[PDB]
Amino acid sequence: MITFIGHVSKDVNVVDGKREIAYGGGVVMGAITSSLLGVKTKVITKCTREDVSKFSFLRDNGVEVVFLKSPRTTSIENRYRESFLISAADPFTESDLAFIEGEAVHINPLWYGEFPEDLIPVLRRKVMFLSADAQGFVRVPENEKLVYRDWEMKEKYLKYLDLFKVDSREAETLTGTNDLRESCRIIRSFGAKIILATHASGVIVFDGNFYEASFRSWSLEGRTGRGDTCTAAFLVGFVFKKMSIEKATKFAAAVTSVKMRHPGPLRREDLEAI
Ligand SMILES: O[C@H]1[C@H](O)[C@@H](O)[C@H](O)[C@@H](O)[C@H]1O
Ligand SMILES: [Mg+2]
């Protein structure tokens, strides 16, 4: 099994002054990918009881979901690449981790404070393969605006992670350089064993050696959840399907490409084009 931990979100997407609502989040994108790829998948999330029916499609895609109690549901406004945290569900606490099973857990937060760093060592002791998304540690609400700030305790916590996911902007925030390969070297030097980095043209995986695969297709509306899809597909390929790191890198790129053809999470029919 793989478990994703993170908030679902009512996304308010604003394009040319037009507001459109999507029910998503990192965990939705990632969990649907792994489930459709044939790995037993669980989500631990928080939202209001009222909003649970907006996320019922998870169960329709084979995902076991634990909807934990919160007085609010996280909602993020995205202006097209600037984001605002409109509302925030309660953060995760240690007790939310109590029923963790499976070979793999991915920490997939939307905002710094959603998943307190103290949970990292607690979770480490419960799982064989622990991964996290940098978004949850560098994207910080300041008067709602989600600003990029360095992760002060990155050197302490990266050493707990088997895999760490970044995009260009997160990598630069953590390293001071916009050279993505160099950022990977620097981030691995902080202690993370494997770095997975997404950028416009494809995927870079670094474990001491670099592996790269380019995306084969893309769309404007399809880019949200690129990284979450890519991470989940890499985890499936490498952790569960026993692929070499090089093969799992190409696999993750292929799965991401077909998801990026449309808005929303990976669809069953996408896997017939890969
Ligand atoms: O990766 C994206 C990103 O964090 C967006 O700002 C958020 O609104 C989406 O829910 C998420 O899938
Ligand atoms: Mg991302």
Residue numbers in the entry: 1 to 80, 87 to 280
Give the text the authors published on this PDB structure:
Here, we identify a PPi-dependent kinase belonging to the ribokinase family, which is distinct from the families of the previously reported PPi-dependent kinases. Accordingly, the phosphate donor specificity of TM0415 was investigated using myo-inositol as the acceptor. This analysis demonstrated that TM0415 utilizes PPi but neither ATP nor ADP to generate myo-inositol monophosphate. Structural comparison and sequence alignment with ATP-dependent or ADP-dependent members of the ribokinase family reveal the importance of five residues: two large hydrophobic residues occluding a part of the ATP-binding pocket and three basic residues specifically involved in PPi recognition. In general, the overall structure of the ribokinase family enzymes is divided into two domains: the phosphate-acceptor-binding domain (the N-terminal half) and the donor-binding domain (the C-terminal half).
In order to elucidate the PPi-binding mode of TM0415, we determined its crystal structure complexed with a PPi analog (methylenediphosphonic acid: PCP), which has a carbon atom instead of an oxygen atom in the bridge position of PPi. In an asymmetric unit, two protein molecules were found: chains A and B. Chain A was complexed with PCP, a magnesium ion, and myo-inositol, while chain B possessed a sulfate ion, which is derived from a crystallization precipitant, instead of PCP without any magnesium ions. The structures of chains A and B were very similar to each other (RMS distance 0.6 Å for 274 Cα atoms out of 275 chain B Cα atoms) and also similar to the unliganded structure (RMS distances 0.9 Å for 274 Cα atoms and 1.0 Å for 275 Cα atoms, respectively, out of 283 Cα atoms of the unliganded structure). In chain A, the phosphoryl group of PCP near myo-inositol (the proximal phosphoryl group) interacts with the main-chain nitrogen atoms of G231 and D234, while the other (the distal phosphoryl group) is surrounded by K171, T204, and R232. The two phosphoryl groups and four water molecules octahedrally coordinate with the magnesium ion, which is essential for the kinase activity. R229 is also located near PCP, but its side chain was disordered in the structure. The disorder of R229 in the PCP-complex structure is thought to result from the inability of the methylene group in PCP to form hydrogen bonds with the guanidine head of R229. D11, N78, Q141, and R145 in TM0415 interact with four of the six hydroxyl groups in myo-inositol, whereas D12, G26, Q136, R140, and D219 in MI3K_TK interact with all six hydroxyl groups. In the TM0415 structure, the probable catalytic residue D234 and the proximal phosphoryl group of PCP are nearest to the 1-hydroxyl group of myo-inositol (3.7 and 3.4 Å, respectively).
